[PDB]
């Protein structure tokens, strides 16, 4: 007779774990993760904020492109988080262990976060990673400000209930640049229409494009620096054909809108 | 030279407090708090379920009613919350040692409950109560069974973040009687403009005085009784003088938007 | 360049996922998990206990062999833990769901099952499974009582800082059964000695040896049957070889002593 | 009909509340809370740590006299606890919230401080404060170190389960200074014999009796100073008459013996 399934892990592309070195991507504002996934450092005078962290097995990485922009792990004030999905949000809490950062996320994101993700509404048990704690639960539109450096939270719910955008205005050349990392759009493999686990599902992503498309932004980023036709391998190049948010929510919406119709289909 | 104050406790109207013998709503659904603070008691063939406990000292009470219901603790299978502050969920820690039920709520009301209402956005430490953990998170308009009655979630934030209305379809001589237990629509000294703790605030509570305008409806509860003309202490006459939604959204949208001016005057 | 390291799954011998049928170990005691993992149920007249649940991928199967004995999901009451590891305690999260079981364990095994058996004193992050809640902690000593039937903890740090050993009374031709019910004495791959993370991890291992010695005990099971001579798969013999408290103790310590000279040399 | 009584706030004598200015306790460890409750303050080169932080309401006066002594609410690291009532943890998750400090407990600790005290094992709901969550568990002699200063956990459970003694070097005219920080030792009330929720109470009390004897101590502190004959109010003299730890013990096992015995009365 047949035994149960082993345990499955959580595989992925191996450019989602290629490591590279940090990518300025404005006066503050570092790319630090790996070609394939985001973690942005923004360096303050009174310490650092980390958004995203990739997967948990970058957390040495990201400690090391710390160091190499003169940030020692102490120096860690504060993580945030598009999503909590373990290809965004793995390596947190080893990260809070090893910095004593705190974390700051809005409630669904925080327990998410709290179970590991585990029993995702739509991804069951496989894509679990270790559970971390939030430390301040944010609103929205709410302000985190360190090092005077203010990060402003939009809720954009879809992809998770918890999914967020930050904005935050950084310079370069003596300008401003206004920095809009928002979460992802996409609804891999999701039951759209009619979901129990996700009632207002639809509602939630239409509303959520509307946000995107009006936020306060020079530069956009996202998790999955595809999504933004970022390509982070390619240098000071990276950032060439990277789209507006109007452009992002747009495709966004677009897929969507197939994906409903197929799923009619 | 003047010590530090004394902790204060959360004191409360003596109706708050009175216990009152169990009130029959419709045909499985009971009143069985005291005479100013709702607690329902849906009984099915499977088990019971409470929306509402009341004050942290009502978990003897309300076991008691329980029980002259028929329900022994275990017997409860369910706790479901309008919001987590002191005087609607403040047995909710007892009931769930002493009967075994599960709690569901949703994200922002299970942060809330899990830190026992402390760091309250406008009320501070003023009134915390024992935490207690929520077993499912639900989310906007997912539906919840016992017994095989239906009770579905529909959020109205305001009063707190995580405020929920739940609806239920009872009986009545043989006729369904759509049950609608809205959330308190409130604001007692809140900053209302600019709140850095909740900054959509405004937009929020506006969008629920809809929802509750266009809930299923054909008898309305409220947390507490007055906010929608219930009498409890009358007995079969507490109906009588009963809002309907739009009613009771109506004089919540007239007091909010009066308290919005004073606020600005 | 080498990316960095897909995350790896926590893989077990075949015969840990074999299902079996139920196996009787005493009137109301059933053996319902794999044939090399302890999942032991105790049926009472008003409802049932779980001890132990195996892997993860376990749960759908406990719950079928539940059923067969009679036992629908919402009749378990109450889930017992040997220790937090994802081979004992794996489906404890999904069991809660599906069963509205509450769990209780002492603190040790809380806090370790809460963060899933993430940051394990000696495992890191290899063995991390869903997280889960403890709706009652218990001490040293402490009696657990369901349908009449009284459970005792014994507390018997080493192989985790939680691991406990559960004692119960049941009964075989009219005469008593005193099941004690062992856990782990095993510390495999340990740091035995100066061991930062647990320093006194040989002085608790030594008097673990003890408590397991003193054990009111009739008839010895452990979470790995192997550990005391048990064989499910051979069904009314399976106990006919089981091991004495005393035996399974000496042949414990006998190994400890062994390894610990093997890590001094 | 006499209403259900209004809840009871936890009130204390007014000496415990009654601020302080910075006392020297040796060359880095300095008393920082009020004349009736230890709060102690040791600063490193790489941040401060808080031993104890007293009442709720203590936490803006501990901030206070941290800025009187250099340390800037950020430059807090770490806090530990002696155990997790109310008037020694009190402020614990406002002092986390406006400091970012980590808080490191063993695991009964760290599930007793996250119910804000509830469900206390004696004394019931009665001095429950605003729950915290561990963001580090430590272990019997586990050491913690900040800034080079390794701190060293003793458990003595009894007082509460997760009673912890604290001990460093510091130093004073040139010669070390071995601080004890022993936790408190009496059982004000408690159910000595036979206490189902703490069945082994008494083994446990005898076991840490002959724990704080042994403490590596040439300066005894206690979390209420007039256990280890401290007077905070009179400044340099305030250590004058301090206890030895075996003088502290011995106190305390002649008072728990009277107790035990009166019980048996
Ligand atoms: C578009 C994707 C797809 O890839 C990841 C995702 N999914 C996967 O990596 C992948 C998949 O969807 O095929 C997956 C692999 C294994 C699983 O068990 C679950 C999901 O991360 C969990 C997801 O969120 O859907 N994330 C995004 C995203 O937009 O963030
Ligand atoms: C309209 C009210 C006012 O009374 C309660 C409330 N407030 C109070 O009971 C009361 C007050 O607002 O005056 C209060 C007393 C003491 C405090 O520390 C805080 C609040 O409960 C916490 C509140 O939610 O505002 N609840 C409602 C409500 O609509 O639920
Ligand atoms: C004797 C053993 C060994 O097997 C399991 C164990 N270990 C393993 O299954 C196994 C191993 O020790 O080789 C393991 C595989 C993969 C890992 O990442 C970690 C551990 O479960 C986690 C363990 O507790 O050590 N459990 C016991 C036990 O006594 O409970
Ligand atoms: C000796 C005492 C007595 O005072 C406090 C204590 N108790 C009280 O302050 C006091 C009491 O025991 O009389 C109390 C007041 C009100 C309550 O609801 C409970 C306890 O703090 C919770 C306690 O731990 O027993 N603490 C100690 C101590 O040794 O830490
Ligand atoms: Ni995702
Ligand atoms: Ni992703
Ligand atoms: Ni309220
Ligand atoms: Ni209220
Ligand atoms: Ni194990
Ligand atoms: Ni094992
Ligand atoms: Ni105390
Ligand atoms: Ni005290």
């Known amino acids: 007779e047949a035994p149960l399934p082993q345990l499955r892990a959580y595989t992925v592309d191996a450019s989602w774990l290629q490591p590279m070195a940090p990518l300025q991507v404005a006066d503050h504002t570092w790319q630090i993760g790996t070609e394939d996934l985001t973690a942005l450092l923004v360096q303050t ?9 990739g997967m948990p ?24 988080l598009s999503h909590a999905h373990a290809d965004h949000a793995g ?8 910095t004593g950062a705190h974390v700051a996320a809005n409630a669904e994101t925080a327990v998410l976060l709290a179970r590991g993700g585990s029993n995702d509404l739509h991804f069951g048990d496989g894509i679990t990673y270790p559970p971390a704690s939030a430390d301040r639960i944010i609103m929205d539109g ?9 990060f402003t939270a939009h809720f954009m719910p879809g992809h998770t209930p918890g999914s967020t955008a ?20 996409s609804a891999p493999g999701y039951q759209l229409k009619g979901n129990p686990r996700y009632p207002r599902l639809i509602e939630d992503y239409k509303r959520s494009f509307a946000t995107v498309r009006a936020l306060p932004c020079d530069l956009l980023l996202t998790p999955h620096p595809g999504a933004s036709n970022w390509n982070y391998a ?15 929510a747009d495709a966004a919406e677009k897929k969507f809108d197939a994906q409903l119709a197929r799923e009619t289909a």
Chains 1, 2, 3, 4 share one sequence.
């Open 234 to 248: 390619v240098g000071s190049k990276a950032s060439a054909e990277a789209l507006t948010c109007n452009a992002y």
């Open 142 to 150: 709410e302000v985190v400000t360190v090092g005077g450096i203010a």
């Open 57 to 80: 097995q970058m957390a040495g990485h990201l400690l090391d492109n710390m160091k190499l922009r003169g940030v020692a792990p102490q120096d860690l004030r504060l993580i945030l």
């Open 45 to 53: 005078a009174e310490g650092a904020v980390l958004l995203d962290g």
């Open 166 to 185: 930050w904005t935050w205005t950084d310079t370069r050349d003596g300008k401003p640049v206004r920095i809009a990392y928002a979460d992802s759009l």
């Open 91 to 98: 390596p947190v809490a080893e990260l809070k262990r090893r």
